[PDB]
């Protein structure tokens, strides 16, 4: 009857099911889920997602969680270096806790303390206005007790009031205004990867729009098996990539070195002690290679996109400003095979 006890049966139903493929079986989003869980598991949290933030200063090393429906990533580190405004924000910290935040996405925010086989898990998850996943921060070995006490102390209210979830308001405005040769022109033209996005923008150009517009030096196309072949390639040499992983309010960068890649069914996942990452090979429907040029030479990456046009991940070469991308990422590219 109630949600809560749906949500028990399809748990029960499905032992193999977290909890945002327990809501999806049950027709809601991942946050009504959650608000059915307070009084239970659960405790509603003060709104303010910029306040949580700021206050995950003070608690130290914890887990950070961002995925999308193609790709999780998971990276130990902390709240530290952060530059908070509402429709860019950072958490700075290469190597650790790197994210890029629309703040104007973030809509509720829980604390979930529950009891496992492995052990109690402690987290605060945050959720959009469609009631999404956004962010999840999960207690660690290291993480300051005290300090996450007092905060949730701070920050959990009694008051747990109805979500109000928001249409989707999605892109959907397709209608490329300018020319193939006028995109690929102002690509060219580009001196720093962030002009990328105002390209699209001022075009209304999706990016595999702008990638087939452009002549193929800038942006072709390699097999699907192509973010295997890198990872491990990586994982031999030990040189150090970026792995970009976002959803609408939230992009998670890691910067390092591959220590160990295991296929697992449809999976193909990446084990660190300081980094996760679990990506369904199989949803690859294209994956491209792009060359963008900078003030510091050409930077490289690798896009993946699923049949509905997401955006998988993106991998790049490790690079600090005024510095080029190193030739043993180019190289590696280069070992990709062409369609």
Not at 203 to 223: C, H, K
Request: net charge negative; with cysteine.
């Amino acid at each position: 009857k109630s949600i809560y006890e749906q949500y028990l049966q399809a748990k029960a139903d499905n032992p193999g099911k977290y909890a945002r493929d327990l809501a999806t079986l049950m027709g809601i989003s991942e946050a009504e889920l959650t608000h059915s869980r307070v009084s239970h598991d659960a405790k509603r949290l003060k709104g303010d997602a910029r306040a949580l933030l700021a206050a995950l200063e003070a608690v130290g090393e914890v887990k950070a969680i961002t995925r999308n429906t193609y790709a999780v990533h998971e990276q130990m580190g902390r709240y530290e270096n952060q530059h908070l405004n509402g429709h860019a924000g950072l958490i700075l910290n290469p190597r650790n806790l790197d994210l890029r935040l629309a703040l104007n996405q973030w809509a509720s925010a829980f604390t979930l303390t529950e009891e496992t086989r492995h052990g109690v898990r402690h987290s605060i998850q945050f959720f959009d206005h469609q009631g999404d996943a956004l962010h999840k921060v999960y207690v660690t070995e290291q993480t300051d007790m005290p300090a996450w006490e007092a905060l949730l102390a701070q920050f959990i209210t009694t008051e747990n009031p109805e979500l109000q979830l928001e249409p989707l308001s999605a892109p959907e405005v397709t209608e490329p205004t300018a020319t193939d040769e006028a995109v690929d022109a102002e690509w060219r033209a580009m001196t720093d990867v962030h002009e990328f996005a105002q390209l699209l923008k001022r075009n209304n150009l999706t990016r595999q729009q702008a990638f087939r517009a452009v002549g193929n030096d800038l942006a072709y196309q390699v097999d699907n098996s192509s973010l295997t072949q890198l990872l491990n390639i990586a994982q031999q040499e030990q040189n150090e990539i970026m792995i970009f992983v976002g959803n609408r309010g939230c992009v998670q960068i890691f910067t390092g070195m591959i220590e160990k890649v295991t296929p697992h069914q449809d999976w193909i996942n990446v084990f660190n002690q300081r980094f996760t990452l679990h990506l369904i090979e199989t949803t690859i429907a294209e994956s491209w290679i792009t060359r963008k040029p900078t003030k510091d030479g050409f930077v490289t990456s690798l896009e993946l996109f699923a049949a509905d046009g997401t955006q998988i991940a993106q991998l790049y070469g490790q690079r600090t400003e005024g510095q080029p991308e190193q030739t043993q990422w180019r190289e590696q590219i280069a070992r990709l095979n062409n369609k």
